[PDB]
Design a binder for this molecule. Structure first.
Ligand code: AMP
Ligand code: AMP
Ligand code: MG
Ligand code: MG
Ligand code: MG
Ligand code: MG
Ligand code: MG
Ligand code: MG
Lengths: 583, 582
């Protein structure tokens, strides 16, 4: 059986078999973990690496096959772009090895005035990321390596207008574009059309949301051309979820559809977006995205619409929409009168024509397009950057919210368990954290790029809690109390029972230490009965300054102490081998 | 079969059969709803009136029979004292009828200077409740009648020192003593001993908690005398709950035990208290109270101990402990060194001797004891007041937290649905509520004494929400918005889905009304698809001022609009008949 769906350059069954066989060849054991089919003609599936819990993707589509091909395609997309590893430091060995990201990557050493080395970027890119000329080189060290001595790692992208290779720092790519504009496919142009369409989806989505645009409805006689989608919608409506199907082309300019679901049970809406040169493919994607990974009982996590236009335009609201679509939407979307008339648009053709048709729209926007091609995993994948259209985070984040900002503290923080510094050093580090302006809520593991696993204290450790630990090690019991209370107020819910119990104990002991007229020995039996001897022992050891870093095991520079991180590195090595062999 | 337990003047099976037969004779159909036996020698049971959801009690004891006799006894205690009705207005007919509470009640009309009429209370009681002489008569109108014209309803109690009848206003009783010191029993003295012991329990409990007293442990060789209790405690400890068994006699003065449970899973404690002249009976009650209505998975609702002395002593903390025992306990309770030595105390004997022994302790405290006797339901019951010992709430509450404080607004508020006042009258009522200083969080149904039932908007209506409704009826859409947001912030969780939906709709419309550059008709179709046509219609009708009191049905003066309240009155009429006949 061979099923050819609109817009794909191969049959579903062929894609599936091919992708499955290649994953296996590369040494990946991928399992399908759960399947959903919540309404007619809407499927989703979750797939994951049996040997690495951090690596998974999700599929979506109008049939079970289409969803599986989608999951597997996304798997190749994320593998090819190293995206599963993007939020992690990959250790000292990988950092100093032949190549960190790709064999054709280029390292640009830091300059003495700490300017951005000349061979990176190009003029338009410099003007777009750094209109102030305030970028330094040392801010652009990639999270994965953390290797300041080796310098700024740049990845090669082909500038489409003149076919020139341009090196864009991993740091800029990782922070500003994340997973937007990546793609994999049966062919080069199928993949590229999907990636370019994704750029349109998110860019136009952001305009629609941020500008509180009222969109025009897709007339019923147009929807009737796509009965599989009409069935899905009718079912949703029968199940108590009103659906609004909108043309998001903004007057026929962009190949974008918007579909909005209401949940009357809680007064909320959920706006989904999709793009493709073919109107029906775009419409379908939008609906299948809506329900991805959601049954009809999982539609309860969204937000009511609002009249507050400023809050809807806030870039953080657009970021939230990217992360989980639970951002704010203006009531103006659902106005009777649309700000653009409906257009029954069509940009469809062969995958070759579609690529040229979409590039013509970027050319007309006067927006340069940069494409990196990847074929080292035996499937075509790409990553497309369009500065000023495909960005997910604003360029100011390179200064304000850079994911490699805490690299320079990694070695120090990982050395704390078993450290034997002078008290003042521990207290000084508290001040350094404050002066460097880290949010107390930041997860240390995210700040340092650690796949800690779930069964130790690093998993849940936030800056605030670290400050508690440093206060204890440093002998400042008043600061210890402040940050121990903070810790419990904002984390007790996610601690294991053992760790929560330790913290109740420790807090009780710290409160007692502030009771000048009370004798600790009078309470000891009661403390032992409430908290257990072990916790009373550990907590007292923390208060003496002897073992303040409770539940934090020592961590080496290749993260051997974290089984989860080891599983991540083993997954990476599979990719490293593939890269070495392809280049 | 006949089972006699320590301290009771009749066999469990005799009490059970007797109490069951009498309830049936009086017209009450009582069912046993749920039974628990969470550890050995600890039982509890919940019983309720099949025809009135608001009437139920709970039993506890060391055996199933003992727990059933306890439930039924408590049933007679609460029926005899009218306590099931204590938080409700009983309507116009009852208010104006031959008698509201008892045939031997006395009504004292209000005076011209609004002093407290002379025949009420006695000199000591006046000095205790009103040391500054600031009590007025009009503040002592009983919640049940609300009948200011008829005056202050006083109930007769017998002062024990000289056997004189003294009339204590229902209002003072209801606000300050609640259910503390009531009792029923197989005999007059068995009941009275239980009631006096309860006064000791709660008075000593409050001292122990409020003063952060470290109590002494009951030595193991004493506990061994009561193996049924020891088995219960060992089981609890094996199940992961450390138990502290303390002597709470404060140096042998009072017949009180304290038992504390720790829940290490939570870091919390739960202190229980119990009293009786027999040390073993007191100990057992304390443990059986601990687990009443709780399985081993229901020990998760308590609070950690604290070092904050002031917060523990706060009277609101002691009130909380009375209401659900979830108040704060000082860590000092669990200190190694006790503030009193253990005393292996014993005040036991016959119920007659026990009554005299306990009265001797009150005589020594120089605390007068007042006792009302009730036998109109065919079972002896009593209610005992010991001013300065049995009080649950402080006398200042007669001024600051009086449960009849909102009676004068009842007629007005109940008339609001379907009312057709001028806008300004609605807004004026908002100001009146503010100026009278009612908390926005107060439930209107509690303020007015309404058994609303759970299926209408009166059930969940708080002052803040009433202000939203008045703002709408009065045409003030800015105030309407403020209080509509307050309403959802603090009540949406307990609204029915239909009511919550109505409030999301209304709030959306009130926000839209503040948007000067937006046209409402542009959003209508979206509003109908989100909220339904009915809610859009009801919310707009509220915003026009035409039907602002959404989900509040009109209420007549006999509360016919509330089925639940009708079921309450029918239960009360069964008691009225019994009273008249006795
Ligand atoms: N039938 C297919 N054959 C090959 N690749 C696919 C197919 N469907 C989706 N993909 C790729 O899988 C990823 C996720 O697909 P989607 O879930 O449709 O956004 C993207 O890289 C797609 O371009
Ligand atoms: N056999 C009995 N057992 C327990 N309580 C009884 C009995 N006969 C009457 N009572 C009364 O039952 C009510 C509640 O009992 P308790 O649950 O022990 O506090 C109190 O008013 C007791 O005085
Ligand atoms: Mg996807
Ligand atoms: Mg994608
Ligand atoms: Mg519209
Ligand atoms: Mg009870
Ligand atoms: Mg009682
Ligand atoms: Mg003690």
């Amino acid at each position: 059986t061979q099923t050819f769906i609109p817009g794909k350059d191969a049959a579903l069954e062929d894609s599936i078999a091919r992708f499955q066989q290649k994953l296996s060849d590369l040494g990946f054991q991928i399992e399908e973990a759960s399947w959903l089919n919540p309404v007619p003609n809407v499927w989703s599936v979750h797939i994951r690496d049996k040997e690495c819990a951090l690596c998974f993707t999700n599929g979506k589509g109008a049939t079970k096959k289409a969803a599986l091909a989608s999951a597997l395609g996304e798997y190749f997309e994320r593998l090819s772009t190293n995206y599963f590893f993007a939020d992690f430091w990959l250790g000292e060995t990988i950092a100093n090895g032949p190549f960190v990201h790709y064999p054709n990557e280029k390292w640009f050493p830091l300059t003495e005035n700490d300017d951005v080395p000349e061979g990176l970027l190009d003029d338009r890119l410099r003007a777009f990321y750094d209109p102030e000329n305030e970028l330094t080189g040392s801010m652009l060290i990639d999270l994965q390596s953390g290797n300041e001595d080796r310098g700024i790692c740049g990845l090669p992208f082909t500038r489409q207008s003149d076919n020139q290779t341009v090196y864009i720092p991993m740091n800029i790519i990782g922070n500003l574009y994340v997973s937007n504009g990546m793609s994999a496919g049966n062919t080069r142009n199928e993949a590229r059309v999907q990636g370019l369409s994704e750029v349109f989806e998110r860019y136009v989505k952001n305009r629609i949301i941020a500008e509180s645009i009222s969109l025009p409805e897709i007339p019923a006689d147009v929807l009737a051309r796509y009965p599989a989608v009409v069935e899905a919608i009718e079912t949703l409506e029968a199940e108590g979820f009103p659906i609004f199907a909108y043309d998001g082309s903004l007057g026929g300019q962009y190949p974008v559809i918007c579909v909005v679901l209401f949940n009357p049970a809680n007064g909320t809406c959920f706006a989904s977006f999709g793009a493709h040169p073919d109107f029906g493919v775009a419409l379908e994607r939008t609906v299948t995205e809506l329900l991805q990974g959601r049954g009809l009982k999982d539609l309860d996590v969204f937000t009511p619409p609002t009249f507050d236009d400023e809050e809807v335009a806030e870039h953080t609201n657009l970021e939230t929409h990217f992360i989980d679509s639970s951002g704010l939407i203006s009531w103006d979307l659902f106005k009777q009168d649309a700000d653009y008339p409906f257009v029954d648009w069509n940009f469809s053709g062969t995958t070759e024509e579609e690529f040229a048709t979409l590039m013509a729209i970027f050319n007309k926007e006067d927006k340069e397009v940069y494409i990196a091609d990847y074929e080292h995993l035996g499937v075509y994948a790409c990553r497309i950057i369009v500065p000023g259209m495909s960005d997910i985070y604003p360029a100011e984040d390179l200064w304000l919210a850079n994911n490699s900002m805490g690299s320079h503290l990694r070695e120090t923080i990982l050395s704390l368990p078993g450290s034997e510094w002078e008290k003042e050093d521990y207290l000084n580090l508290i001040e350094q954290l404050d002066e460097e302006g880290f949010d107390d809520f930041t997860r240390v593991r995210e700040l340092l790029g650690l796949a800690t696993g779930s069964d130790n204290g690093w998993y849940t450790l936030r800056i605030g809690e670290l400050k508690a630990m440093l206060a204890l090690a440093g002998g400042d019991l008043e600061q210890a109390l402040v940050w121990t209370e903070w810790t419990m107020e904002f984390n007790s819910s996610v601690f294991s029972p053992e760790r929560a119990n330790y913290y109740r104990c420790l807090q009780t002991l710290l409160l007692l230490a502030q009771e000048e007229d009370r004798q600790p020995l009078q309470y000891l039996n009661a403390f032992v009965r409430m908290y257990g001897a072990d916790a009373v022992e550990a907590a007292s050891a923390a208060m003496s300054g002897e073992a303040a870093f409770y539940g934090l095991q020592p961590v080496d520079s290749d993260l051997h102490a974290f089984a989860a991180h080891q599983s991540l590195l083993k997954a990476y090595e599979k990719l490293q081998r593939a890269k070495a062999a392809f280049w």
